[PDB]
């Protein structure tokens, strides 16, 4: 065990090196290691095949360092890795799309708040067992199609506080067993109509604090099990386009929130749910 780090065998074999002031990934970490805590240090790169010896790794944290890049095969050798935390890494920005290849038994992956500009094609490819996906507080500017396709068992997906401007048809395709989907606090303008299809089991949907002026007829239906919904402070235009959406909020006997209007100038700050239908102009 290397300079000023805890090392214990029960419950699991463990290297705890929290805020030592480390400039990079340390030599010395036993191959027996079942958990590696390298968080709060000041590491600026994860070299190729850093933790390759530790073929037993199930939890590794590298959050709250000064990450500039992860090398594309950093997590090579880590078949069993279950938890991976890579957050509070402010200035990181991009993760090579092959970085996660073959982390087959991964349960949880954290990229909360990393200033991620893109979401490379097939980055979450082959993450069969991924369950929790934390991608909030970044600078994500689009959502490619199929970006999470291979995410069979993802229940919680976290996307808030980004700069997304739209949701395209096939973005959320494959999230067959999603549960909480948080999409609030974005610059979001248009949802694609057939966009939530593959989300039978969706339960929580937070669309508040966006740029949504209207939600078109076909959208919400496939959420056959939605229990909570949030659509507050959007520049909602309350005329014939909302009738579709209006009809929906009537039938929905779960728990929605206020849908305040803003337009026409005549109909400002008026929860839609308590409007009449003839109230909304034509057409």
């Amino acid at each position, epitope marked *: 065990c290397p300079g000023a780090c805890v090392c214990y065998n029960e419950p699991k074999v463990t290297t705890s090196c929290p805020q030592q002031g480390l400039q990079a990934v*340390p030599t010395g970490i036993p191959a027996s290691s079942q958990r590696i805590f390298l968080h709060g240090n000041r590491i600026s790169y994860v070299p190729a*095949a*850093s933790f*390759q010896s530790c073929r037993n790794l199930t939890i590794l944290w590298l959050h709250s360092n000064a990450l500039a*890049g992860i090398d594309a095969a950093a997590f090579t050798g880590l078949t069993l890795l279950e938890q991976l935390d890579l957050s509070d890494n402010a200035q990181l920005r991009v993760v090579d799309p092959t970085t996660f290849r073959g982390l087959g038994h991964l349960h949880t992956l954290h990229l909360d708040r990393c200033g991620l500009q893109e979401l490379g094609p097939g980055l979450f490819r082959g993450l069969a067992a991924l369950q929790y996906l934390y991608l909030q507080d970044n600078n994500l500017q689009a959502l490619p199609d199929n970006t999470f396709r291979d995410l069979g068992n993802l229940t919680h997906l976290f996307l808030h506080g980004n700069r997304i401007p739209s949701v395209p048809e096939h973005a959320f395709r494959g999230l067959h067993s999603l549960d909480r989907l948080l999409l609030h606090q974005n610059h979001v303008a248009r949802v694609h109509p057939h966009a939530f299809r593959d989300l039978g089991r969706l339960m929580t949907l937070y669309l508040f604090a966006n740029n949504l002026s209207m939600l078109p007829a076909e959208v919400l239906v496939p959420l056959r099990s939605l229990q909570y919904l949030r659509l507050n402070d959007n520049p909602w235009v309350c005329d014939c386009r909302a009738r579709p959406l209006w009809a929906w909020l009537q039938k929905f006997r779960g728990s929605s929130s206020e849908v305040p209007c803003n337009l026409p100038q005549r109909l400002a700050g008026r929860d839609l749910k308590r409007l009449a239908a003839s109230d909304l102009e034509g057409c």
Partner: antibody
Amino acid sequence: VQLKESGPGLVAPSQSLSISCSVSGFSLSSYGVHWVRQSPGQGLEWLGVIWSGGNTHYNSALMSRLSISKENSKNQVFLKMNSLQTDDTAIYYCARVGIYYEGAWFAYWGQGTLVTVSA
Amino acid sequence: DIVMSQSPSSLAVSAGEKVTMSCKSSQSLLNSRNRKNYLAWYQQKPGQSPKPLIYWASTRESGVPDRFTGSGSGTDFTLTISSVQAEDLAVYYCMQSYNLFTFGSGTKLEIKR
């Protein structure tokens, strides 16, 4: 923390070399070992390494020639080298640290065991 | 492939004069982002194994006298002693750590008297 290279010290050409590198100050499961060579009047040259895990990367400049094994409990790294000419007369240092990264880049050495290829 | 080039192989100075080694690499040794440069310097005193003086082009190993400097980026790397001590007689090797491990050919400090 130290490494102390040893073993067969004159080897006849077209035959086998066997070095051992013994250690105090650290375990072979926790850190990985290297092997640097240096002539009796030339620059250093890196031969290979055996990582904290079972894996092993040599320099292939020496084609088949080369094999690094290590015995973990016995705290010994073995450097075996067959089929060597008098090109390979040199001192044979084992050094350490160790890989992935920070910790050391041959920041520890041996004094180095000097091999002569001659008959 | 990857290659390390040291000049001027051997250079004599009195004790107190400044110096510089020159170490050019075959391929650039700078990590795109974070910008640390994977290059070390080593000191081989006579009849004595090498000893780490510097790594990451720039930063000094534990203990190594504050009187050394190493700089340059990408592909040109200085080692500089200001006010050379008598005890600093050695040959000076730079080492690449980007693609495995490739050494220079070394540069010997002579001492004028």
